[PDB]
Design an enzyme around this catalytic site. Structure first.
Site, PDB file in Angstrom:
ATOM      1  N   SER B 167       0.930  -1.200  -0.017  1.00  0.00           N
ATOM      2  CA  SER B 167       0.246   0.521  -0.034  1.00  0.00           C
ATOM      3  C   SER B 167       0.887   1.352   0.273  1.00  0.00           C
ATOM      4  O   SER B 167       1.531   1.070   0.381  1.00  0.00           O
ATOM      5  CB  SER B 167      -0.828  -0.019   1.395  1.00  0.00           C
ATOM      6  OG  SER B 167      -1.722  -1.030   1.271  1.00  0.00           O
ATOM      7  N   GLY B 168       0.551   2.091  -0.869  1.00  0.00           N
ATOM      8  CA  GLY B 168       0.892   4.001  -0.202  1.00  0.00           C
ATOM      9  C   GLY B 168       0.647   4.472   0.898  1.00  0.00           C
ATOM     10  O   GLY B 168       2.231   4.485   0.787  1.00  0.00           O
ATOM     11  N   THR B 172       2.927   3.390   6.995  1.00  0.00           N
ATOM     12  CA  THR B 172       4.531   3.811   7.634  1.00  0.00           C
ATOM     13  C   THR B 172       3.520   4.802   9.203  1.00  0.00           C
ATOM     14  O   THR B 172       4.665   4.597  10.161  1.00  0.00           O
ATOM     15  CB  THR B 172       4.575   5.323   6.694  1.00  0.00           C
ATOM     16  OG1 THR B 172       5.829   5.641   7.986  1.00  0.00           O
ATOM     17  CG2 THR B 172       3.497   5.912   6.990  1.00  0.00           C
ATOM     18  N   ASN B 212       2.907   3.701  -8.533  1.00  0.00           N
ATOM     19  CA  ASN B 212       2.892   4.039  -7.100  1.00  0.00           C
ATOM     20  C   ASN B 212       4.050   5.402  -7.038  1.00  0.00           C
ATOM     21  O   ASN B 212       4.657   5.796  -8.252  1.00  0.00           O
ATOM     22  CB  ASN B 212       4.109   3.351  -5.695  1.00  0.00           C
ATOM     23  CG  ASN B 212       3.880   3.949  -4.368  1.00  0.00           C
ATOM     24  OD1 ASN B 212       4.838   4.759  -4.479  1.00  0.00           O
ATOM     25  ND2 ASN B 212       3.453   3.166  -3.560  1.00  0.00           N
ATOM     26  N   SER B 215       7.604   3.867  -3.192  1.00  0.00           N
ATOM     27  CA  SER B 215       7.965   2.360  -3.633  1.00  0.00           C
ATOM     28  C   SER B 215       9.489   1.823  -2.203  1.00  0.00           C
ATOM     29  O   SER B 215       9.968   1.912  -2.719  1.00  0.00           O
ATOM     30  CB  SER B 215       7.846   1.511  -4.988  1.00  0.00           C
ATOM     31  OG  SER B 215       7.205   0.743  -4.225  1.00  0.00           O
ATOM     32  N   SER B 216       9.017   0.698  -1.341  1.00  0.00           N
ATOM     33  CA  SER B 216       9.500   0.431  -0.900  1.00  0.00           C
ATOM     34  C   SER B 216      10.055  -0.857  -1.102  1.00  0.00           C
ATOM     35  O   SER B 216       9.334  -1.899  -1.146  1.00  0.00           O
ATOM     36  CB  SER B 216       9.525   0.053   0.591  1.00  0.00           C
ATOM     37  OG  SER B 216      10.685  -0.330   1.496  1.00  0.00           O
ATOM     38  N   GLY B 438       3.700  -7.056  -1.236  1.00  0.00           N
ATOM     39  CA  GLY B 438       3.145  -7.324  -1.497  1.00  0.00           C
ATOM     40  C   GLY B 438       2.819  -7.761  -3.457  1.00  0.00           C
ATOM     41  O   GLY B 438       3.492  -7.286  -4.023  1.00  0.00           O
ATOM     42  N   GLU B 440       1.290  -8.580  -6.609  1.00  0.00           N
ATOM     43  CA  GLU B 440       1.698  -7.711  -8.084  1.00  0.00           C
ATOM     44  C   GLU B 440       0.854  -8.419  -8.611  1.00  0.00           C
ATOM     45  O   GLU B 440       1.600  -9.039 -10.016  1.00  0.00           O
ATOM     46  CB  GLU B 440       2.705  -7.339  -8.237  1.00  0.00           C
ATOM     47  CG  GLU B 440       3.433  -5.590  -7.491  1.00  0.00           C
ATOM     48  CD  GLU B 440       5.186  -5.270  -7.003  1.00  0.00           C
ATOM     49  OE1 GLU B 440       5.934  -6.375  -8.037  1.00  0.00           O
ATOM     50  OE2 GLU B 440       5.511  -4.726  -7.112  1.00  0.00           O
TER      51      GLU B 440
END
Ligand SMILES: Nc1ncnc2c1ncn2[C@@H]1O[C@H](COP(=O)(O)OP(=O)(O)O)[C@@H](O)[C@H]1O
Lengths: 370, 715
Positions: B167-168, B172, B212, B215-216, B438, B440
């Protein structure tokens, strides 16, 4: 579990683990025994030294090669060398590792069958396989189409391959290699005053050959230039001082490859056998066999052998074909590199000769099926 | 009464007894209230003849009944009677309307981003979850955190909080608030410390994906340790599998890690004067394969934040110029050019300018670097021998070197962060907060999507086996004699063709090794080994007008269509040990630090699988708790959610997978008092021994009656 690659060779045993970039154990395939008396009690005398331990005690031993011309002729010595390779150089246990042996083409079936029986009986390997040195050299060269000239220490052979299909009716095998060039150099040196008769002195001659010999591009005018000046003279130092200087022997030794009538052989040179093996294939694939002459093995390491081979084959082949000589700087270990690549493939783990199959069939399985 | 002590959060945790009791008594008909599919809302309520503003007639085995008003706002969806996708979707939507953003789904704790400030964290009044079990307090994430704490102190096990990472936003803040709750209960603060080191890990591990803008691209495992008896200790972060193949190659409409464009934004001229770099991103091949600028983030302020975060850390003046120089050297790697030798097949350099700049930055010798790239050495036995390298092999080596340098610098940065956050006496147990990208499902899936989906298959198998264990224990406790095949491994283990040594990744590695291999040979081998023999591997239904796919896998979150074009070029990772030996003796101290520590077979897939095994081994020694944050809509509007978006997320999250799992045993589990009371209308064995319904749809044990999905919907 990893696999072992044990490219045997007639003059150097190269072993290692499938997946590595280079063989971990490289030592001369020699079994030496003491000739002399032995007077110092308590020295701890050994029965016979193998590998390069017999190379360091070279003075008092008589060195023997259990592989003569790609064919194993002394089997207890080969068992000793295999045991050494497994336990003292690699330091493994063969019962836990599949082993990929390697062999030259057009040699008796008893060789492969005894290899398989010895492995599965006295080493209890879970699986094994006996490939051909040329196919592995092709794997290592990074291509699927080419005619490989693999020249080691016991045998020279050509195997033309196109798109992964071997043409067995065009496989040409020739029985002069590094050892015959060493013997010819030993015999050609006596005409200058140096006499080598012992096997230790044969190893000394081998080192002279590896350090000073080279292939002349054009043999006759090179011979004339050597006869005129002394600019082709170079000095070598035996291991007691006592330096020697050689002149035209430098390029008279490896010329035996292209003129095998020097050592009383009737066969053709390596360039002409390569061209004949190409001209034995179907007319639609020789255009691509011409541009993929892959050199491999130790005897193909003389400075200037690629240029001479290309010049000869270009003078032989028609004036339109592109003759390319592929000469990698590591071609001395191409067979082992290709063997590790092959033993790493996932699609190959179905090709092993499992011990159960051996128990079901007998030693005759190695060639009838695999 | 038992709920009035939450203050201003009571309205957002539980509805009053009045509104609940008047919402559990709506007159709704059984056989004339169902769900019918749709195109824009994908699912609508209806009354076959159905109407909700429009009329549609569909088959009489595709309408699913709505749950009765007795299950209208239930906060544990495993307790509904009709478990299907519209039911769960609309239960989420209905609880989000009458603002209640958290809801349990069996084991998960589904969170919805509200975009509106709510006092659901406000004071200790809402932090009064101290001891309240999951079965008593309302459904908060605080219940997950406090139960992890209670388990850590009762069983003396390490615990983990696997949270959504795809998720965007909203993830966090969830991590921040879990860490804050842990700091508060077992009380320069730890939360502020973990937040201080964030801009550096962002600038070096965040990349603009297509779906996004931040993105991590790695898995951050923040572990906060606790003392012997339960006092908070220091916290170290542990980073896991990093998408390092992004440093080289970027798809269209993407970028690589932000640090490059941050440095290159010409906000600080000192760097662009010291790195010997220009300001045009289109000059360097490693940074400008996709796009070079996005309008959702400005790079100058991010660069200032990164520099100030470096200054906050113990970074000294030389250990910052070191990082900047290494990034500039990775930029100069991409535009080195080599040519085939005249009449030969050996690579030789044409133009040494980029080589000069990179060797002067990394503190090396340009001639030695070029000779080591073109003529690597190998140790054969006890001697050394040179080796041949074509232009393609030299380019592979340069790419692998750039990737290795970047990942080693990233790990060094994580180590320095762990160091500046490390201060306490010895400690026993910890609570991990695993955050990872997650599932995709794009319109064009590639190798990276395959790797990420493999990771998430592993994680979902982990969760499924965990739920298998818990269901086994809860059945054995109630004496319900009922055995069933393992939930986790015997369901997703078939979609792990990818790892078994004949599957997709094994074949890809074999094709990377084989001579003259291409994409067509790889496709042919895949089809020869898997098409028809395995039922999960399938040939895609390629429609004229969409991206061309080559095969399709039946995952846990649907079927994904992969496109293999270019996998061989991206899966190779051959390291040049001669240049690594040059690195180990560099003049720049940071390079020697990075490479302080009787090879041509390295691939991206093998390293990914090894790191995945390591992560799974770390996780399996713990007790996991799962959290699932959800983006309700894309236009940030609070209160209203788009059904296609939320349904896509709810499929990829694994919630619907857990629901499919719970729909196979006995989900509806009721006590004997409540059922003996509400369904006394004519002990419990006798009352149920009169109906015509069935005999196997229920099971009795130890003050609990069990029901299959659909028996409490008839009553
Ligand atoms: N630099 C060199 N120049 C010429 N001949 C060489 C050189 N190095 C090795 N040789 C020859 O190559 C032989 C070894 O070749 P190799 O490929 O190991 O054969 P095998 O595999 O049968 O042992 C040695 O007999 C040696 O004479």
């Amino acid at each position: 579990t990893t696999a072992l690659v044990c490219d045997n060779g007639s003059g150097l045993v190269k072993a290692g683990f499938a997946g590595d970039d280079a063989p971990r154990a490289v030592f001369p395939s020699i079994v030496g025994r003491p000739r002399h008396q032995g007077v110092m009690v308590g020295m701890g005398q050994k029965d016979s030294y193998v590998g390069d331990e017999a190379q360091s005690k070279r003075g008092i031993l008589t060195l023997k090669y259990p592989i003569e011309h790609g064919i194993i002729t002394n089997w207890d010595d080969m068992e000793k060398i295999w045991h050494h390779t497994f336990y003292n150089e690699l330091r493994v246990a063969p019962e836990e590792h599949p082993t990929l042996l390697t062999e030259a083409p057009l040699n008796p079936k008893a060789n492969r069958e005894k290899m398989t029986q010895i492995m599965f009986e006295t080493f209890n390997v879970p699986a094994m396989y006996v490939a051909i040195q040329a196919v592995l050299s092709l794997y290592a060269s990074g291509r699927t189409t080419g005619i490989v000239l693999d020249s080691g220490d016991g045998v020279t052979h050509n195997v033309p391959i196109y798109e992964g299909y071997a043409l067995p009716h065009a496989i040409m095998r020739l029985d002069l290699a590094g050892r015959d060039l060493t013997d010819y150099l030993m015999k050609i040196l006596t005409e200058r005053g140096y006499s080598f008769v012992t096997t230790a002195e044969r190893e000394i001659v081998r080192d002279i050959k590896e350090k000073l010999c080279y292939v002349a591009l054009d043999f006759e005018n090179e011979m004339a230039t050597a006869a005129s000046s002394s600019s082709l003279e170079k000095s070598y130092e035996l291991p007691d001082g006592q330096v020697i200087t050689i002149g035209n022997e430098r390029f008279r030794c490896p010329e035996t490859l292209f003129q095998p009538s020097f050592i009383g052989m009737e066969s053709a040179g390596i360039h002409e056998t390569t061209y004949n093996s190409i001209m034995k294939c179907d007319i639609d694939i020789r255009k691509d066999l011409y541009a993929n002459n892959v050199l491999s093995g130790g005897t193909t390491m003389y400075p200037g052998i690629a240029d001479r081979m290309q010049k000869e084959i270009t003078a032989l082949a028609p004036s339109t074909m592109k003759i390319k000589i592929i000469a990698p700087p590591e071609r001395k270990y191409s067979v082992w590199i290709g063997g590790s690549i092959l033993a790493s493939l996932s699609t190959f783990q179905q090709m092993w000769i499992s011990k159960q199959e051996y128990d079901e069939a007998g030693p005759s399985i190695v060639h009838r099926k695999c | 009464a038992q709920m009035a002590d939450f203050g201003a959060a009571a309205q957002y945790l539980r509805k009053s007894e009045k509104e609940r009791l008047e919402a559990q008594t709506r007159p709704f008909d059984i056989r004339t209230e169902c769900f019918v599919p749709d195109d824009k809302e994908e699912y609508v309520k209806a009354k076959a003849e159905t109407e909700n503003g429009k009329t549609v007639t569909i088959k009489e085995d595709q309408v699913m009944q709505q749950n009765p008003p007795k299950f209208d706002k239930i906060e544990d969806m495993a307790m509904l009677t009709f478990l299907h996708e519209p039911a769960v979707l609309y239960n989420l939507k209905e609880r989000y309307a009458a603002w209640m953003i958290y809801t349990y789904s069996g084991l998960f704790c589904v969170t919805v981003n509200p975009y509106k400030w709510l006092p659901v964290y406000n004071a200790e009044v809402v932090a009064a979850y101290r001891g309240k079990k999951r079965s008593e307090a309302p459904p908060h994430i605080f219940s997950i955190s406090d139960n992890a704490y209670q388990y850590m102190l009762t069983d003396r096990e390490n615990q983990s909080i696997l949270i959504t990472g795809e998720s965007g936003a909203g993830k966090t803040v969830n991590t921040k608030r879990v860490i804050q709750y842990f700091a508060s209960i077992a009380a320069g603060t730890l939360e502020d410390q973990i937040i201080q080191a964030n801009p550096a890990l962002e600038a070096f591990g965040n990349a603009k994906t297509v779906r996004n803008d931040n993105s991590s691209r790695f898995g951050k495992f923040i572990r906060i340790h606790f003392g012997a008896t339960g006092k908070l200790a220091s916290a170290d972060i542990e980073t896991y599998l990093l998408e390092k193949s992004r440093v080289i190659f970027q798809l269209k409409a993407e970028r690589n890690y932000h640090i490059f464009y941050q440095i290159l934004s010409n906000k600080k001229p000192e760097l662009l004067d010291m790195l010997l770099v220009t300001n045009n991103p289109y000059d360097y091949a490693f940074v400008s394969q996709g796009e070079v600028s996005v309008a959702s983030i400005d790079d100058s302020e991010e660069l200032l934040a990164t520099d100030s975060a470096f200054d906050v850390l113990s970074f000294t003046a030389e250990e910052k110029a070191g990082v900047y120089k290494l990034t500039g050297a990775i930029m100069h790697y991409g535009n080195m050019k080599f040519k085939q030798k005249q009449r030969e097949e050996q690579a030789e350099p044409d133009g040494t300018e980029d080589a000069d700049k990179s060797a002067y930055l990394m503190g090396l010798n340009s001639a030695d670097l070029l000779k080591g790239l073109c003529h690597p050495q190998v140790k054969v036995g006890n001697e050394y021998v040179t080796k041949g390298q074509s232009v393609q092999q030299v380019y592979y080596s340069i790419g692998a070197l750039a990737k290795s340098v970047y990942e080693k610098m990233f790990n060094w940065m994580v180590t320095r962060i762990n160091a500046t956050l490390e201060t306490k006496q010895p400690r026993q147990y910890f609570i991990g907060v695993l955050d990872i990208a997650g599932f995709e499902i794009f319109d064009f899936n590639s190798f990276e999507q395959l790797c990420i989906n493999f990771t998430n298959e592993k994680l979902q198998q982990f969760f499924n086996h965990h739920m298998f264990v818990l269901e086994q224990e809860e059945y054995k406790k109630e004496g319900i004699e009922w055995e069933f095949i393992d939930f986790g491994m015997d369901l997703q283990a078939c979609i792990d063709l990818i790892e078994k040594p004949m599957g997709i990744m094994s074949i890809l590695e074999e094709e990377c090794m084989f001579p003259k291999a291409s994409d067509m040979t790889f496709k042919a081998k895949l089809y020869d080994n898997h098409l028809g023999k395995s039922n999960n591997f399938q040939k895609p239904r390629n429609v004229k007008g969409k991206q061309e796919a080559h095969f399709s896998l039946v995952h846990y979150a649907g079927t994904v269509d992969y496109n293999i074009m270019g996998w061989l070029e991206k899966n190779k990772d051959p390291l040049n040990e001669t240049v690594v030996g040059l690195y180990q003796k560099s003049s720049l101290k940071l390079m020697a630090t990075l490479f302080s520590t009787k090879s041509s077979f390295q691939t991206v897939s093998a390293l990914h699988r090894e790191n995945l095994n390591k992560l799974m081994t770390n996780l399996k020694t713990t007790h996991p708790h799962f959290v699932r944050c959800i983006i309700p809509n894309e236009r940030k509007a609070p209160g209203v959610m788009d059904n296609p978006l939320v349904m896509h997320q709810l499929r990829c999250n694994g919630v619907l997978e857990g629901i499919r799992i719970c729909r196979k045993g006995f989900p509806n589990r009721i006590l004997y008092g409540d059922f003996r009371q509400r369904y006394r209308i004519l002990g419990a064995e006798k009352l149920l021994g009169s109906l015509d319904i069935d005999h196997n749809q229920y099971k009795f044990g130890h003050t609990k009656v069990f029901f299959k999905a659909g028996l409490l919907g008839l009553l």
